[PDB]
Paper text:
The enzyme CdaA, which synthesizes an essential second messenger cyclic di-AMP (c-di-AMP) in many pathogenic bacteria, has emerged as a promising candidate for the development of novel antibiotics. Additionally, c-di-AMP regulates the bacterial stringent response, further underscoring its significance. The synthesis of c-di-AMP is mediated by enzymes possessing a diadenylate-cyclase (DAC) domain.
To identify crystals suitable for fragment screening, CdaA enzymes from Streptococcus pneumoniae, Bacillus subtilis and Enterococcus faecium were purified and crystallized. Crystals of B. subtilis CdaA, which diffracted to the highest resolution of 1.1 Å, were used to perform the screening of 96 fragments, yielding data sets with resolutions spanning from 1.08 to 1.87 Å. Additionally, we report the first crystal structures of apo CdaA from E. faecium (EfCdaA) and S. pneumoniae (SpCdaA), as well as atomic resolution structures of BsCdaA. Evaluation of the tested CdaA crystals from three different bacteria revealed that the BsCdaA crystals were the most suitable for fragment screening. Consequently, we selected B. subtilis CdaA for the fragment-screening campaign due to the excellent diffraction properties, high reproducibility and quality of BsCdaA crystals. Notably, these crystals tolerated up to 20% DMSO in the reservoir solution, which facilitates soaking experiments. In conclusion, we have demonstrated that a structurally related enzyme from a nonpathogenic bacterium can be used to identify crystallization conditions that yield crystals suitable for a crystallographic fragment-screening campaign.
Author numbering:
A (entry chain B): 102 to 254
B (entry chain A): 103 to 254
The structure:
Amino acid sequence: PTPVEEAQQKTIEAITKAINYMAKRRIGALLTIERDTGMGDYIETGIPLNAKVSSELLINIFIPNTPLHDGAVIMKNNEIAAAACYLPLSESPFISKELGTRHRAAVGISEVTDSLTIIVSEETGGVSVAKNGDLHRELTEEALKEMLEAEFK
Amino acid sequence: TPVEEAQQKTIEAITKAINYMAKRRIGALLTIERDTGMGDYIETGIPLNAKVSSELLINIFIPNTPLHDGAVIMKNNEIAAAACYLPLSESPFISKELGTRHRAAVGISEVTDSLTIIVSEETGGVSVAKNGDLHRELTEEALKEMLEAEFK
């Protein structure tokens, strides 16, 4: 693999380790991966970080009742660009009625960008992904990893 | 000047984080690299190279989280790394009630010209280690003066 390929795989491993940890602990999380549609307008609503990715930093961001936990983390290639970012809320009727604002925000950004958003439910620990206006719920660890690898292909 | 405004913004971010941690008696260890390079200690932690903000500093030091166990090292107006090793001082002149966090701050200050801020988990007291000495029980004004003197 090229350095770009190695760096992408390290980023995927960091994201999946963080998501898995948060899912087991029922730590709510909202993580958007910017793709080809630029998300600068949303990144600028958050607290700038421009930080190297690590699973440790991703987990620390989402700990309940902390300064960075309320809103979305937006990742740009191999960096955490900003935390506590605003995303627009979807009104789609295909969002399960029991789901709250994190999932609606995720679907909402997926309606106006080609980004991939991961959501961890604070109620159930279930992991979902929003892409292209659709929410895909109850993902296994293997399904999430494959989704990310296919996204970064 | 722009450089002066950036240094002030960083001081404000550090002091806001320190105040929050002191109030909640969150232990913390924050080393500001100066002329002596600290790359060998930076390398022991989790790389960040992040923008400074009070929010990020507070999120790092939350007890029982991946990043809280060690020092944050700042360099060139950024957070270089978290959870870094610092060497323990063997000085017999540190207050005997103080533990490893304070001994680590004094230890790095023995071998570098860095400034290290410590918040005690026992009391929320704020101290600064520099040149092998620990300056204890600082007021907010006292810490700001130290940061401004350091950066002058």
